[PDB]
Amino acid sequence: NLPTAQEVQGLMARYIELVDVGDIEAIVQMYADDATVENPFGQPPIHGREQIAAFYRQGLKVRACLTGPVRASHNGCGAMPFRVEMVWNGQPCALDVIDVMRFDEHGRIQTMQAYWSEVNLSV
Amino acid sequence: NLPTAQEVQGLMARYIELVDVGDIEAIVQMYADDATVENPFGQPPIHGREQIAAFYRQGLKVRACLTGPVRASHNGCGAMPFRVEMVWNGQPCALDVIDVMRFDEHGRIQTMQAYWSEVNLSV
Numbered sequence: 001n002l003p004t005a006q007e008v009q010g011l012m013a014r015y016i017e018l019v020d021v022g023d024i025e026a027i028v029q030m031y032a033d034d035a036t037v038e039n040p041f042g043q044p045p046i047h048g049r050e051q052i053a054a055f056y057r058q059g060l061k062v063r064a065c066l067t068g069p070v071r072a073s074h075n076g077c078g079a080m081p082f083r084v085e086m087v088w089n090g091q092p093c094a095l096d097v098i099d100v101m102r103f104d105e106h107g108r109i110q111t112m113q114a115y116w117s118e119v120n121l122s123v
Numbered sequence: 124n125l126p127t128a129q130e131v132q133g134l135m136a137r138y139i140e141l142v143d144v145g146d147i148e149a150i151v152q153m154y155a156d157d158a159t160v161e162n163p164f165g166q167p168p169i170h171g172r173e174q175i176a177a178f179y180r181q182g183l184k185v186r187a188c189l190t191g192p193v194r195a196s197h198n199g200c201g202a203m204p205f206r207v208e209m210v211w212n213g214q215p216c217a218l219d220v221i222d223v224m225r226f227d228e229h230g231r232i233q234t235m236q237a238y239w240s241e242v243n244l245s246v
C-alpha cells in the first residue's frame with residue numbers, strides 16, 4: 001500500500017539500482033500506469049508508461065548511484081540525491097540530480113520531479 | 124527578479140550559510156512576506172514571516188552544510204541536500220535533509236519543502 005518512510009527509502013534506492021543496470025522494463029513497472037515525469041523539473045510532464053518507457057530507453061553504458069541518503073516523509077513521498085555518469089559523443093560526463101517522488105496507495109511512483117540543469121553537468 | 128538557475132544556486136547556498144551561523148532575521152528576510160514552509164514535508168504548512176521566524180528561532184549551537192551541489196531549474200526552483208548538526212539534551216545528533224524551494228519574481232522564497240523523517244536522524 002502507501003509506502004512507509006522506510007519503504008520509500010527502499011523503493012527510491014531500488015529505482016537508482018535499476019537505472020544503474022539500465023533495466024528499462026523494471027523501471028517502468030515501478031511507475032503507476034498513468035504516472036507523470038517532469039525531467040528536468042521545469043519542462044512539460046510526460047504522461048503514462050508508454051511515454052515514460054520511451055524516455056528511459058532513449059536516456060539509457062550509464063552508471064548511477066546515490067550520493068547521500070534517501071530523505072523520506074510519512075505521506076508516501078521522498079527525495080534523493082544521486083549522480084549519473086554517461087558518455088555523450090565519446091566524452092564521459094556526469095550529472096548531479098535530485099529526484100522527488102510521490103508514491104500511490106499501491107506503492108507505485110505516481111509523480112517524479114527530477115531537479116537538475118546544465119549547472120549540474122560536468123564533462 | 125525570478126532567479127536564474129545560477130542565482131538559485133547562490134540563494135540556496137546562502138540560505139544554508141545563514142542557517143549555519145543562525146541568523147534568524149536574515150533567514151526570514153530571504154522568504155516572501157507570505158511564504159509557506161512545510162518542515163518536515165507531510166506536516167501542515169506554516170504561513171508568513173512571523174510564523175517562519177518563530178519556527179527558525181525555536182529550531183536554531185547548530186552547524187549546517189551542503190552535502191552536495193544545489194540542483195537548480197530554469198523556473199526559479201531548486202533542491203539541495205544538506206546535514207544539520209545539533210544537540211538535543213546534551214546528545215549531539217545529525218539530520219540529513221533535502222530542501223525544495225520555489226522563488227518568486229522578486230527573488231524571495233515563496234515555498235520551501237523540507238524532506239526528512241526520523242530515518243534521517245542520527246545520534
Ligand SMILES: Oc1c(F)cccc1F
Nearest residue numbers: 019039084097099114115
Ligand atoms: O531519474 C533520473 C534518472 F534515472 C536519470 C537521469 C535523470 C533523472 F532525473
Ligand SMILES: Oc1c(F)cccc1F
Nearest residue numbers: 142162207220222237238
Ligand atoms: O531548512 C531546514 C533547516 F534550515 C534546518 C532544519 C531542517 C530544515 F528543513
